[PDB]
Design a protein around this motif. Sequence first.
Motif, PDB file in Angstrom:
ATOM      1  N   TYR B  17      42.699  54.280  36.115  1.00 30.97           N
ATOM      2  CA  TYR B  17      42.340  54.422  34.696  1.00 30.97           C
ATOM      3  C   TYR B  17      40.826  54.472  34.464  1.00 30.97           C
ATOM      4  CZ  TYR B  17      42.073  49.282  35.090  1.00 30.97           C
ATOM      5  OH  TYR B  17      41.760  48.003  35.484  1.00 30.97           O
ATOM      6  N   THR B  18      40.071  55.030  35.411  1.00 35.65           N
ATOM      7  CA  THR B  18      38.643  55.237  35.210  1.00 35.65           C
ATOM      8  C   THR B  18      38.278  56.690  35.471  1.00 35.65           C
ATOM      9  OG1 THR B  18      38.056  54.625  37.488  1.00 35.65           O
ATOM     10  CG2 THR B  18      38.031  52.880  35.821  1.00 35.65           C
ATOM     11  N   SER B  19      37.180  57.113  34.850  1.00 32.60           N
ATOM     12  CA  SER B  19      36.623  58.433  35.056  1.00 32.60           C
ATOM     13  C   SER B  19      35.820  58.480  36.352  1.00 32.60           C
ATOM     14  CB  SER B  19      35.732  58.821  33.878  1.00 32.60           C
ATOM     15  OG  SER B  19      35.127  60.083  34.093  1.00 32.60           O
ATOM     16  N   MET B  20      35.488  59.701  36.763  1.00 30.10           N
ATOM     17  CA  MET B  20      34.569  59.924  37.869  1.00 30.10           C
ATOM     18  C   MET B  20      33.158  60.272  37.408  1.00 30.10           C
ATOM     19  SD  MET B  20      35.462  59.345  40.904  1.00 30.10           S
ATOM     20  CE  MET B  20      35.240  59.677  42.638  1.00 30.10           C
ATOM     21  N   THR B  21      33.009  60.868  36.218  1.00 31.10           N
ATOM     22  CA  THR B  21      31.681  61.179  35.695  1.00 31.10           C
ATOM     23  C   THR B  21      31.019  59.971  35.046  1.00 31.10           C
ATOM     24  OG1 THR B  21      33.032  62.330  34.038  1.00 31.10           O
ATOM     25  CG2 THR B  21      31.472  63.665  35.337  1.00 31.10           C
ATOM     26  N   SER B  22      31.813  59.020  34.546  1.00 35.65           N
ATOM     27  CA  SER B  22      31.285  57.813  33.907  1.00 35.65           C
ATOM     28  C   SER B  22      32.198  56.638  34.228  1.00 35.65           C
ATOM     29  CB  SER B  22      31.144  58.011  32.399  1.00 35.65           C
ATOM     30  OG  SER B  22      30.177  59.007  32.107  1.00 35.65           O
ATOM     31  N   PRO B  23      32.245  56.225  35.492  1.00 38.88           N
ATOM     32  CA  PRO B  23      33.033  55.039  35.845  1.00 38.88           C
ATOM     33  C   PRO B  23      32.420  53.778  35.258  1.00 38.88           C
ATOM     34  CG  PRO B  23      31.651  55.701  37.688  1.00 38.88           C
ATOM     35  CD  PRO B  23      31.514  56.774  36.654  1.00 38.88           C
ATOM     36  N   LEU B  24      33.282  52.846  34.877  1.00 38.14           N
ATOM     37  CA  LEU B  24      32.818  51.513  34.530  1.00 38.14           C
ATOM     38  C   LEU B  24      32.432  50.758  35.800  1.00 38.14           C
ATOM     39  CD1 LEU B  24      35.673  51.034  32.018  1.00 38.14           C
ATOM     40  CD2 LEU B  24      33.328  50.517  31.323  1.00 38.14           C
ATOM     41  N   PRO B  25      31.572  49.740  35.691  1.00 40.67           N
ATOM     42  CA  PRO B  25      31.188  48.981  36.890  1.00 40.67           C
ATOM     43  C   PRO B  25      32.402  48.359  37.566  1.00 40.67           C
ATOM     44  CG  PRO B  25      30.645  47.746  34.916  1.00 40.67           C
ATOM     45  CD  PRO B  25      30.995  49.144  34.471  1.00 40.67           C
ATOM     46  N   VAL B  26      32.358  48.309  38.890  1.00 35.53           N
ATOM     47  CA  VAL B  26      33.397  47.650  39.669  1.00 35.53           C
ATOM     48  C   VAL B  26      32.747  46.525  40.458  1.00 35.53           C
ATOM     49  CG1 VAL B  26      35.010  49.598  39.789  1.00 35.53           C
ATOM     50  CG2 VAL B  26      33.199  49.377  41.508  1.00 35.53           C
ATOM     51  N   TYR B  27      33.524  45.458  40.690  1.00 34.97           N
ATOM     52  CA  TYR B  27      33.018  44.250  41.329  1.00 34.97           C
ATOM     53  C   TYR B  27      33.444  44.205  42.782  1.00 34.97           C
ATOM     54  CZ  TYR B  27      31.668  43.057  36.740  1.00 34.97           C
ATOM     55  OH  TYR B  27      31.079  43.089  35.504  1.00 34.97           O
ATOM     56  N   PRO B  28      32.517  43.999  43.711  1.00 41.12           N
ATOM     57  CA  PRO B  28      32.894  43.984  45.133  1.00 41.12           C
ATOM     58  C   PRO B  28      33.554  42.663  45.500  1.00 41.12           C
ATOM     59  CG  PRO B  28      30.555  43.557  44.904  1.00 41.12           C
ATOM     60  CD  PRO B  28      31.073  43.803  43.510  1.00 41.12           C
ATOM     61  N   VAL B  29      34.842  42.725  45.857  1.00 38.22           N
ATOM     62  CA  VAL B  29      35.563  41.577  46.401  1.00 38.22           C
ATOM     63  C   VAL B  29      35.695  41.773  47.908  1.00 38.22           C
ATOM     64  CG1 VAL B  29      37.719  40.291  46.374  1.00 38.22           C
ATOM     65  CG2 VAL B  29      36.810  41.213  44.230  1.00 38.22           C
ATOM     66  N   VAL B  30      35.316  40.755  48.694  1.00 40.89           N
ATOM     67  CA  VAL B  30      35.347  40.875  50.154  1.00 40.89           C
ATOM     68  C   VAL B  30      36.415  40.001  50.807  1.00 40.89           C
ATOM     69  CG1 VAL B  30      32.920  41.487  50.153  1.00 40.89           C
ATOM     70  CG2 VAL B  30      33.594  39.105  50.552  1.00 40.89           C
ATOM     71  N   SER B  31      36.935  38.995  50.104  1.00 38.68           N
ATOM     72  CA  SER B  31      37.968  38.123  50.638  1.00 38.68           C
ATOM     73  C   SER B  31      38.596  37.395  49.466  1.00 38.68           C
ATOM     74  CB  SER B  31      37.397  37.124  51.661  1.00 38.68           C
ATOM     75  OG  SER B  31      36.596  36.144  51.027  1.00 38.68           O
ATOM     76  N   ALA B  32      39.663  36.655  49.767  1.00 40.01           N
ATOM     77  CA  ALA B  32      40.401  35.967  48.719  1.00 40.01           C
ATOM     78  C   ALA B  32      41.149  34.815  49.356  1.00 40.01           C
ATOM     79  CB  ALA B  32      41.376  36.898  47.994  1.00 40.01           C
ATOM     80  N   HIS B  33      41.187  33.686  48.646  1.00 42.68           N
ATOM     81  CA  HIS B  33      41.846  32.494  49.153  1.00 42.68           C
ATOM     82  C   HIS B  33      42.475  31.743  47.985  1.00 42.68           C
ATOM     83  CE1 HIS B  33      38.471  33.575  51.821  1.00 42.68           C
ATOM     84  NE2 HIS B  33      39.287  33.236  52.803  1.00 42.68           N
ATOM     85  N   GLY B  34      43.676  31.196  48.204  1.00 38.71           N
ATOM     86  CA  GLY B  34      44.301  30.373  47.169  1.00 38.71           C
ATOM     87  C   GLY B  34      44.451  31.154  45.878  1.00 38.71           C
ATOM     88  N   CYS B  35      43.832  30.646  44.800  1.00 36.97           N
ATOM     89  CA  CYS B  35      43.893  31.308  43.501  1.00 36.97           C
ATOM     90  C   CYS B  35      42.545  31.907  43.116  1.00 36.97           C
ATOM     91  CB  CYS B  35      44.390  30.337  42.421  1.00 36.97           C
ATOM     92  SG  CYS B  35      45.099  31.128  40.959  1.00 36.97           S
ATOM     93  N   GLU B  36      41.719  32.238  44.118  1.00 32.66           N
ATOM     94  CA  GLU B  36      40.351  32.697  43.908  1.00 32.66           C
ATOM     95  C   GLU B  36      40.064  33.977  44.693  1.00 32.66           C
ATOM     96  OE1 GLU B  36      37.720  29.258  44.932  1.00 32.66           O
ATOM     97  OE2 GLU B  36      37.512  28.996  42.763  1.00 32.66           O
ATOM     98  N   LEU B  37      39.216  34.820  44.100  1.00 27.32           N
ATOM     99  CA  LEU B  37      38.653  36.013  44.729  1.00 27.32           C
ATOM    100  C   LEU B  37      37.199  35.736  45.079  1.00 27.32           C
ATOM    101  CD1 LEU B  37      40.059  38.699  42.192  1.00 27.32           C
ATOM    102  CD2 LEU B  37      41.170  37.708  44.251  1.00 27.32           C
ATOM    103  N   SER B  38      36.748  36.240  46.232  1.00 30.43           N
ATOM    104  CA  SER B  38      35.375  36.014  46.677  1.00 30.43           C
ATOM    105  C   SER B  38      34.587  37.316  46.552  1.00 30.43           C
ATOM    106  CB  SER B  38      35.338  35.490  48.113  1.00 30.43           C
ATOM    107  OG  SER B  38      35.944  34.213  48.212  1.00 30.43           O
TER     108      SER B  38
END
Lengths: 389, 390
Positions: B17-38
Amino acid sequence: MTLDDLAFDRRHIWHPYTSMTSPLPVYPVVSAHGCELSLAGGEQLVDGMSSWWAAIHGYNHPRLNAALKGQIDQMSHVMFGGITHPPAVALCRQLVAMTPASLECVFLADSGSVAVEVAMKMALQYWQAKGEPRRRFLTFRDNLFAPAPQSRFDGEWDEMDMVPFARLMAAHRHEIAAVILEPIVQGAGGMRMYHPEWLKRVRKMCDREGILLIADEIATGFGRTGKLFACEHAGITADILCLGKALTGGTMTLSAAITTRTVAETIPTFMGNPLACAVASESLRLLESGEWQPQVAAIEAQLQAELAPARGSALVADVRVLGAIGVVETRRPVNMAALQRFFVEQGVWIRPFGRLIYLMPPYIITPEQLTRLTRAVNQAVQDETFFSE
Amino acid sequence: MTLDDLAFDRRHIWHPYTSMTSPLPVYPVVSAHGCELSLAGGEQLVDGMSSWWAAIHGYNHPRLNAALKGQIDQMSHVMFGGITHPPAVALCRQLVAMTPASLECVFLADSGSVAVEVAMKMALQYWQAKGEPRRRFLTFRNLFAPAPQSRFDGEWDEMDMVPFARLMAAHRHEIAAVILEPIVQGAGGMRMYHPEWLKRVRKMCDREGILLIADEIATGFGRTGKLFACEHAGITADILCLGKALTGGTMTLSAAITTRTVAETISGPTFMGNPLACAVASESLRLLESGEWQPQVAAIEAQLQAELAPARGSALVADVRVLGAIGVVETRRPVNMAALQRFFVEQGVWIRPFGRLIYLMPPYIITPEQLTRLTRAVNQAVQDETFFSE
Ligand code: NA
Ligand code: NA
């Protein structure tokens, strides 16, 4: 696996292309290694199917295993909405780098059919965005169905083959959003094979009309026909390229549509799945060495040589080989139960279909293992009892 | 993750649900544990989305990890044509046992959408074999019946069913199946419908012989406070579709389960029955067999009801609706996605809004304190006009 497990599977578990009132016997596979399947009873089977295309590095590959385990340690999965992650970037970098320069925007998806659906929707939105809406697709057998080109794929070309496509094009040029095809080998169309000049001509006719070409290389891609992508047999590049199966080394499902910047500009849980991206990246790394090329050429040459005598069988209509694909088309449909039993009793896994007994082995298969496969095929097509009327 | 990685993702990688000419910012997630994203920067985010439904056991779960690794050691994959294997049998045994007795034939598939398509193809072949080929499907907004207006947790007005009954009777010989999500419309703006509506659909389908397809790909496996959301109406579908939380949100898999009558009347796919996915799905279901999901989800529901209730007092909020471990805040104006997403990340929470919807579907293992961070952020969000367009 127990006798009750087999009864439960028979009564409650659908398998592809079988009924649930009169299912055919299934064989219990419990593990797999190299180019072999291990049956519950302990029998080893030489695999001739690559689990349908995808398992090009064989089974239980140490590097694919280690890629999966290493990604599991970080995270099996996170959503792709508003998030990106190292496995997706690493995989897309490989996909963009290994495809022609014009193919540079990657849409990751779960399954092959979804990537094709995505390609078709891209083609719809392309024309809508250009102020010139087009809703029809042209494919080969309100959609437009062109017949298959008749010229033998590895023999001489007759220009007359293009007339029905050309006349459809002339009649509907302005309504066609895209042409969709599999290049050369029709993995979804009876394993038939088409002359590359047909593909070259389709690309040029699309170029002339501005029509998008969608190439489905979910079966043909990643070296299987002896080229990294089967589009290379005609010297052409698609506007949208759909990929899957061998993408992951056949460990788990993943697919992709890759398109041009012009398409992309003019334009949910498991999209981008880290686990699948990580193993696909390792599968592509295995291809980077280039070893698949002499492997597939050696397989192709052995397939040509050991399947050529099948042309001499009255029950055989055609033998066709390209890359690591050997197809024997019979004049009558196979007796599925009897012929499958024969293959397993010969220690090989070959899964025929209707009038098709075909081989698509993993690239790591040994000469002796492959000779076991072709021996069984040749023996099969010499006996009438393996064929109904 | 490097700056060049982010630039490559932005220029070459589509996100939902994002464009290629004007994407919204995306957040880099590198790992995940329990109920948390890193995040790549080391920040931890409390997850409120379960990666869209499926990660009900949280992230990096030791039992799910060991199931996957144990299967990799035997085989990641083998084809299902002419072949069966221990993971497929073990999963199908669980799926048959945990569903009502009438649901007993399992068709495994890759993804949620394929399971629904398989269910509809089953319905087409069902009528084709009975010499009565029917080709249309009735859904709620193909024939589209008005969604029932009765508040899902309030009083029932049977007048809701009059348009549906009119359409079903007018087209009874063209309708192969009614397709719906029970109660919660995960693919319908997170709207929620009264269980009596679902009860009445089943009875009308029974009188006509029309198949009922229940898509529980979002609602299944405890999310609404019942093992399957059909239980809120006390009904059983003819075909039940499942996915997402099936695998614990580790990798895609789906299933369509039907009755013997459907399966008998009816009577390559490289990754059908994938051993690896079946192996982790079996362990995900094993995790539910203790029944611990029941008080976990009930506690989440009561905390959602209490902590989201004040948002009803916000001029920007049209509705708050909570069922099981789902809490939905529907706003009167659509969100400013960039500004609101940044606020959530800065608050240390992962909440992914869409249009006029700010909603929570956290993992079942979420703590009270983690969940209060999610609800406080939502309440703060819908009191601030700065997070909304016109
Ligand atoms: Na490229
Ligand atoms: Na059941």
